[PDB]
Amino acid sequence: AGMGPGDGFTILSSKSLVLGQKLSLTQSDISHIGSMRVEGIVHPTTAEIDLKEDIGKALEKAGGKEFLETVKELRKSQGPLEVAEAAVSQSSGLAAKFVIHCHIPQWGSDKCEEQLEETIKNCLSAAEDKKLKSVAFPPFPSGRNCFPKQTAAQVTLKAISAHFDDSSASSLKNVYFLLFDSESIGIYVQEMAKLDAK
């Protein structure tokens, strides 16, 4: 019995952290981001807050004129985004309430692993600041000389645990990792196995 948060999403494997947050690896149809029953969606992007990759295009297609307008206004009012910075836009055409845009660091840059850790912590901070109960992280960008999958998964899971160890009041109860690639899924499975969970 395959089940998950909205049509297009299936939970593959989950781990429950000591203070009760649930991390769930989720088989995902990114084109169904509009149906996703998760309150916040992370949009990994650049300083310019551009709409590339499956997530950017799915948010663009679901959002319409209202979304293009909200991103344009956010660029004017808060942009450009600094490295590891997160900024929020009210959703258009989604079950989610907000899109959490973040400027992810480039692999090979000075302390990029620590900056990825800060990025993930800033996303969680942006979600909690809207009192969101759940947040979804889409696939990490995979262009030229991008972060190795094992490193990105290790760092993200470390950041998440650390954030929740440092809070006793965060509204977030569920974190989903949206994945569809068999190798990416295996990597998250291997990395989650090492956590203090269930």
d(CA 121, CA 127): 10
d(CA 100, CA 88): 5
Give me the helices (H) in 79-148, please. Answer: 112-128
- The residue type found at 113 is E
Residue 18, helix vs strand vs coil: coil
| Residue boundaries of the structural domains of the chain | 1-198
Residue 189, helix vs strand vs coil: helix
Fold of 1-198: Leucine Aminopeptidase, subunit E; domain 1 (3.40.220)
Resolution (A): 1.6
d(CA 192, CA 142): 21
Alpha carbon distances (Å) from 109 to 122, 147, 152, 167, 191: 19, 10, 14, 29, 23
d(CA 28, CA 47): 26
Q: Cβ of 11: how many Cβ atoms within 10 Å?
A: 15
Report helix angle 149-165 to 182-192, nearest 10. Answer: 40
